[PDB]
Every structure is written in C-alpha cells, then in structure tokens.
Amino acid sequence: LPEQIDWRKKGAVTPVKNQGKCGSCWAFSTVSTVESINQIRTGNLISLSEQQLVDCNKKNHGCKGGAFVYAYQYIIDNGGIDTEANYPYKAVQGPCRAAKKVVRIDGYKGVPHCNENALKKAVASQPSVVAIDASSKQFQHYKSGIFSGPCGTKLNHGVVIVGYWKDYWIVRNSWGRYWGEQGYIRMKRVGGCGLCGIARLPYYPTKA
C-alpha cells in the first residue's frame, strides 16, 4: 500500500472541531469517520452533527462518555445523521430533537487488535477511529513534533487516524486548533498495541 497518505490532502476531512468541556470524544471521532467515508464515496464533504448523537443515543452517555460500536449502530439504525448546521453542537446534552437524514452508512468493521499493519491497511482505505490513553500531561500539553510518549495503554480518549507516514500516524483530535499541530498530533508507530494503545480498538464505518 502507499508509503504515506493524508485524507486531509484528499479533501476527505472537515476543519478541526472543539468538543469543548463535555466528554463526547466518542461522538466527534465517530462522526468524523462518517463525514469521511461519505465524502470518499459521494464526492461531497459535509459537516455532520455530534450533538444529535449526544442527545439521541441512549446506548451512550452524552457528555459522560460513550463507545464506537453503539454510535455507529445508532447512525445506522436511525437511518442517517444530520448536519452540523441544522443540529449545532452545544457541549451539553439535551432532549433528542427530530433530525434530517442527510448522511447514511451501511455498517462498521473492527480492525484486528494491536496489529498496526491491519490498521495501516484500514487507514489507507478511509479514516478510522481509535482509543488512546490521553491522560499523561506530556500528551495533553503536546504542541508539536512526532510524539513518542510517555503514555500508558489505558483507553480513555477517542480520536481519528486520518493518514500515516513511515513512522507515525496522523491523528485528528477534537480539542480545537490551539492544541498540537493546528488540532492534529503525529504519533510514532511502534507496533504492538501502539503508542498510548492507539492500535487497541480501531474501527471504520462502511458505506456500500
């Protein structure tokens, strides 16, 4: 497969977003991969609604956390997801409003655990969600360069891998542009379960 890929360079990734002070990383990462597969398939780049998920996804827990599988499953079950414009983000949970089904997906697949080759194969197809230990201070204060740790493998933050180079993953965070490299962080590729456990629980939506 390609030595390097960057979906941002292919117009598959929307501008960086800020989940603000609400534990919704499960929504932002999930929605981003949806926005991505949709553009890759339809040629349309559309910003989708995290808030919808936050409000209408019982299986997950609004600002109190969530999981990849359920998010995807929701979007699928619900028959589609609405745009960022009609259902803006509020950084605080609320009653499920009715929403327009702008974008739809057919399924989602898991990438084999702690297998960075498989993950490379997946990212080469389309951006993917991953869980990382984002609890270390070094990571939280990461500003630039190829981050190589330290960070454990305790899964607590959800992000997206939008591309890669020979020795690092191009990760998209949901903390705005004033964190890392204009919102992104280049995480070294170290095999095993990966840096901060980045290769522990990867996934990507599917659209036929």
Ligand SMILES: CC(C)C[C@H](NC(=O)[C@@H](O)CC(=O)O)C(=O)NCCCCNC(N)=[NH2+]
């Ligand atoms: C695996 C990734 C997505 C971490 C995830 N935590 C979150 O969603 C966030 O707090 C992420 C964030 O940056 O806000 C998580 O696993 N949290 C657990 C929440 C459990 C929900 N509460 C229960 N058990 N009812």
